[PDB]
Structure 1
Amino acid sequence: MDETGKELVLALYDYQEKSPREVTMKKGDILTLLNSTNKDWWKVEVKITVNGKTYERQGFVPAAYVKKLD
């Protein structure tokens, strides 16, 4: 969450990540739309705080389970 203010998306339904490349989202979660070239698999970025260290990473998720903020 670097207040990029570019492309934000809100999750409507719950989802889980099967691979280390994907990301786990839940109904009400906010993700940073990095790549929306696809219609089924959307590439979003999330923030993971580990050991007091904020980490960034982009993963694929079901667009049908989420929506665009604007």
Structure 2
Amino acid sequence: MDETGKELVLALYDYQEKSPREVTMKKGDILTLLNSTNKDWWKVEVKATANGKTYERQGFVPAAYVKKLD
């Protein structure tokens, strides 16, 4: 698994993606931080299981609900 070993953020409040170019999280969840160039939204990589395979996808999350564990 080469999708966990750089940065991660903790999810304070649950979320609910609305677009295909976005992700979601749950209270007490952890997402691998990818980019934080912004101050309102952060780019994290989530995981998903389909067709009997595990793959990760990129998305954006509210920095107001999530906080890096740096």
Mark yes or no: TM-score above 0.5.
yes
Query: Pairwise CA RMSD of aligned residues?
Result: 1.4
TM-score, normalised to structure 2's length?
0.90
Unaligned runs of at least 5 residues, structure 2: none
Unaligned runs of at least 5 residues, structure 1: none
**Percent identity over the alignment?**
97
1:2, CA displacement in angstroms? 3.4
Report the secondary structure of 2:64's partner residue. Answer: helix
* Structure 1 or 2: more helix by fraction: 1
Which whole-Å deviations, capped at 9, do the CAs of 1:24-63 have from their partners, x for residues lacking one?
1111111111110001011000010112201111101101
- Pairs aligned (count): 70
Return structure 1 stretches of 4+ with deviation > 6 angstroms: none
